[model samples]
Target: KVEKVFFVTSPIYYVNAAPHIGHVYSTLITDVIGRYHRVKGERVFALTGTDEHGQKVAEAAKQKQVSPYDFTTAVAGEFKKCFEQMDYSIDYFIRTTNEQHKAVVKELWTKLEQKGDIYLGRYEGWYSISDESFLTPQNITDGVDKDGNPCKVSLESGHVVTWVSEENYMFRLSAFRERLLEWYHANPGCIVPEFRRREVIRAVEKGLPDLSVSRARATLHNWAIPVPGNPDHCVYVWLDALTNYLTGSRLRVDESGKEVSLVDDFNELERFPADVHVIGKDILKFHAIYWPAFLLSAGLPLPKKIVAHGWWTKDRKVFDPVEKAEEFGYDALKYFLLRESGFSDDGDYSDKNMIARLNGELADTLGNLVMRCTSAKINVNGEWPSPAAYTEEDESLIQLIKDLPGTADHYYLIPDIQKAIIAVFDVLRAINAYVTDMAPWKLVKTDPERLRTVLYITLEGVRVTTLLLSPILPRKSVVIFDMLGVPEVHRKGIENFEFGAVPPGTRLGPAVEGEVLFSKRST
Candidate 1:
């Protein structure tokens, strides 16, 4: 019985490229999760946006001969437009460049510094520009770069061998590894999708690395936020980026327009901790270890879970050399990434593979069922027909309908959205089989009574299926609901759960004249 909830965020994207399939994948999953909660009548807040500040953005701006401010604004605008185009119902669009967020970062830095958790230190390390990460000797591999030259890594020698031995602030991350490991162990199911938990544990076992929290006075850039107490030093990139979650989640306002402040010692409370931090596996080390340790040093509650999902590879095979594989079209790419992958495991994304799934699942099976049921009714009965005498098949279909609320509720409770989607598809598969077996076309000719019962049961199945699946496929579900004659299916509280929500003999409205819910463009 969860009440108020918050989905923290997607890890901010490096503003180097325009929005890609990877960006859409993260936002789509979060959007589906937030939608599930809303269906359950929970107060849900979904946060997503771009990471606008950092040396990367500054460097890109210099190359483009534009101010960092102008560059990020242009790129971030594209991110916003992409989400809108994808029909994302995000509650907040957080940008690190926002003054409100900057203030929060400064406040957090000051608190940590005041607690003596922050210190000045000289730092030197192998920094990889390709990955935008500081690497140890272990990360360097003997390989050739794109220029056919001997390099330290596979991609390129984006590594800079800079000797920097100057004063910079550092956070004491090594202080809290044990406590974090213990917390993770104690809370088994808290971390989602299973495999992510293993990754987090394995990373911590490798031992925590000391992280630099600020750059020295000489290397300072205009794009970065200044350190809280020291104006000359710039805050570290990851340190500033991680603060967005804290800024957004910390008490601001309730749905009733009431201001709720964080508790007096809110840092100590378990609820103060983030329930889950969704991120890609590529940067799991920072979120799973570094970020949590930072919270501990600042005397704040640690996040309950850090779940890292897999990357969108080209195809099922890891290294498939298909021309323009990376540039898969938007809709095809988005569908495959969100549907094919689980929370913890990596999934493949290719144009051909995406087309197969969309054509099979969305267009052929689910869409075919809707088109057949509605078109059959309009042709035979001249309108939608009410069930007269219920058969065993009709009863079976209704039983499945009744089972949806509980099935969906349990799935959401476990927070396993992938499985929840599978459950809905299971219903779709069953309905398609029932339609074929019942043979409503023959029933229309021989026994009109049986035909009416069959059509009614199938239509009702469509109604229940739409309601259950509304969370994942929202817009399409609305089209199905409208066709079934029950335009307003979701009730405020009572409909939150499944128990007999649709009234018996509910008169459905006129079916929309044109527009197919699903269509196979090719083949």
Candidate 2:
């Protein structure tokens, strides 16, 4: 029997430029969610890659005095390196330029054509080169260019648009408008955060025209996949780019570096219809509206969910994720992004704010709690001590830790990431309060037996909370688990998050004098 996979994808990043904060944020979220599913013991396939074909990429190549292939290769290399540096748990990176992706796009195109969902037409409308989107009059607005000249721009992106007239292939997008609405009504949560769902519904209610699915070859400098049997026209950028998700589910890179599909038979592609497509809000219509319609036209299963997240600004300006990841560790960066930003709202990244979260939350609260629980004065034997008995406060704290996974599981479905992370920290905060009230340091000398019991309770709290935190802090949490002497088998899966899971007599890792989980970042 084929097992279902929890498939997740970040929007195939546009490679005209190198990776940015927005791009990192999208994949960072998927990484955390994917990691959560894995900790829940689910099979996960996380996919992310570069979108290489477009007029902007062609322009960027000319500006760099290199071939489009060479330009995209350089940027895609940088993107791969950045994601690895961030330690994102990406399973497959599907480049739109891959031959395997081209084949998949062609096959999907043929399916749609055979269904009579495609037709040739002249595209005479405003087109946004910045976004590579064909826009209607309703989606266009008058705006001034950077040179102060009046020009047409996309209402959605504010990118300058130019009038274009060319013969191109058009998809029967209008044919699916009512069906799209019906699907939305049937699957209420398919588009997340409710508001995004309402946004798509409003646009569809307004109407969907037949969409242009190909661009004139000369317009893209011959940098795109040519329409089958027609070399003069290339498949439109969105059609080609969106197909990367389908191609990724089926294709794999072999040991010899050759691309191969997971199964020889298309009918057996088990991971098709990704569980979630995490994307930026700017492209919500593309993923929620166009992509789904395309999938429907091809008789494929629609995506289970498409989460559109808000943008990120640093000091109210675009932030650099790589720079911040360098200053703070990737784990801290991942935690900060997930903690500071609302999944569906805009976030402003500030050094002061980041430093505050690092020092106040991670260093002061979590790190200090770990230090106090395992300090030399209390845990002098360098081993987990046997508990004497549980008190009312101790029992309550243990129950809270035990119930944490269920609490986090709820928000992960809503994807209120900030809440889920804050929930873990809340338990840690409670443990901190418990430590302050119990004061094991004083008990060590006056009442040694009581001290041992309190120490075990505190350490147990640390272990359970660490298990709850593993998804966000994969590396650092492992270090904490090692220090707690937690067996590798017991460190993962929320099912293992129970009281006394780490039994007494297990030797904790030797305490290092100066090592710390997180150092306070100075503003």
Candidate 3:
């Protein structure tokens, strides 16, 4: 039985813009991790949602001629739809605008305020509306805008910034510098993608400054969560946004299968510090530095790890990831993304490359291997063929399959998604090679007994591979599972990755004519 929930969060995406490939990439990593843990018999809580209260959102709402709430809901629906289309397995989808979320943010703010970690102060700096943060002088540089005019922009995001001076609430971020470094020293692996960990440490080491935690209400168009007592101020987007993670923890499902907030009873806070937070490299500082500082101030536990991945640039029209997930098979696209990205580095996308990979890896290698091993021409008896005496060739293939579950476990523990994917494919590749050398088709006439053993070993190999692929290819793997007549009980979890899990002489499911696991894509 599991004691603590394996909580995972995808950064609540900003609703100022529609969903993009970058958002999809971040969410998928969390989704994959959640699914892997769930299959391993751990209780999992996966949180994904939209960040709806911010200056960017308020301005976008005005440009679109809609209320802030209306615009936020509309775009949030788009993100929900996209995740649905991609078959994401998320436990709860949170919107920062939710009343419970607002309550939780205010509660956390009050807690920090009571602890003397927040105070009213004057703030004067260059603020970038797009970044929703004030940039230090060193982080700002003169640059040209879209029209080739002189302007100031953020050196990191390249978004335009403007001078702003106002009285707002401030966080005692400067006081936490030593504590933050101490935490980093104790938990060296808290930030992933080694380069990002170094970048954040270096930034914090340079110096720390108190952060503006709220904006003047009127300046923000009065479209944000108001400070607990002072309605004249709106909470800073990052402070309010980051609190959504705690809000998610406060949610619980009742016996009636309905969700409820555990606001009254904040004890244990079992899921307070999430097990993993998957985000983009662009937002590392907020998550790695400020987030932990806020938690420490409130006497809350910090999250276990933050997994940051690099950007994606497409050579094709990928503005609509929802449409692409449909045009290319959803599982196919999901699998390709994981297969291509190393989880800690950048990845490029192209429809042409996607097509080529699906055809070669899915269609030609795995699809063909499954088809031949289970086809009537090979199995002959309409059942799992019984093997004769084992040989060196057969033993080698079995050894590979037996060793696979552990190999996959190691990679998944590192959360090295790309390497885990490569390992599964390697097993399939070896099975394909094994079949060619045995030539079961020829053995059918030359040595009938030898043919049965070859077919049995090959089918078992496919069964194990399908189980390994289940987390990444949930939908497609089920179809293969049904075709292989895999027992309902054995269809899930890595515990079932045993040799001969399928009984000899067990009847195979009837094959549908002309059906392929992954159809070859042309164009």
Candidate 2: residue 69 lDDT (0-100): 90
Q: All predictions: root-mean-square deviation over Cα? A: 4.9, 2.3, 2.5
Rank candidates, TM-score, best first.
2, 3, 1
**Model 1 per-residue lDDT tens digits across residues 347-379:** 655556666777888777788888777674433
lDDT of 3 by residue, 1-523 (tens): 4378888999888888778887888889889999988777777889888989888889989999989988999999998988877788888888888888888998899999999999889899999888787888989999998699999998878888998899989999999999999988898888887777888899999889999999999888988899999989999999999998898888885664336765554444467678899887777888998999999999988988888877532111235667777787888888988998875455657888888889989888889998887788877787787889999978998999999888988777666778888998999999999998888888878999998889888888898888878789989888887877777887766568788888887777778877878988886
Which candidate gets the maximum TM-score versus the true structure? 2
Q: Would you list the clashing residue pairs of candidate 2?
A: none
Q: How accurate locally is residue 81 in candidate 3, as Cα lDDT from 0 to 100?
A: 84
Q: How do these models rank on lDDT, best leading?
A: 3, 2, 1
lDDT of 2 by residue, 1-523 (tens): 5568888898887787778777788888888888888887888878888889989789878988999999999999998888888888888777888887888888889999999999999888889887888888988998999899998888877888999999999999999999999999999989987888999999999898999999989989989898987888899988999998888788765764346664443445467888888888788888999999998988998988888887631111345677787888888988888888885465656888889999999998889998887777778887889999789988898889888878988888766678888998999999999889988889978988898888888898888878778888899998898888888888877558678777888888877888888998667
Cα lDDT of all candidates, in order? 0.67, 0.84, 0.84
Candidate 3, superposed: residue stretches over 4 Å from native: 254-258, 265-269, 312-317, 343-346
Report clash pairs, candidate 3. Answer: none
Stretches of candidate 2 above 4 Å error? 254-269, 312-318, 344-346
TM-score of each: 0.85, 0.95, 0.94
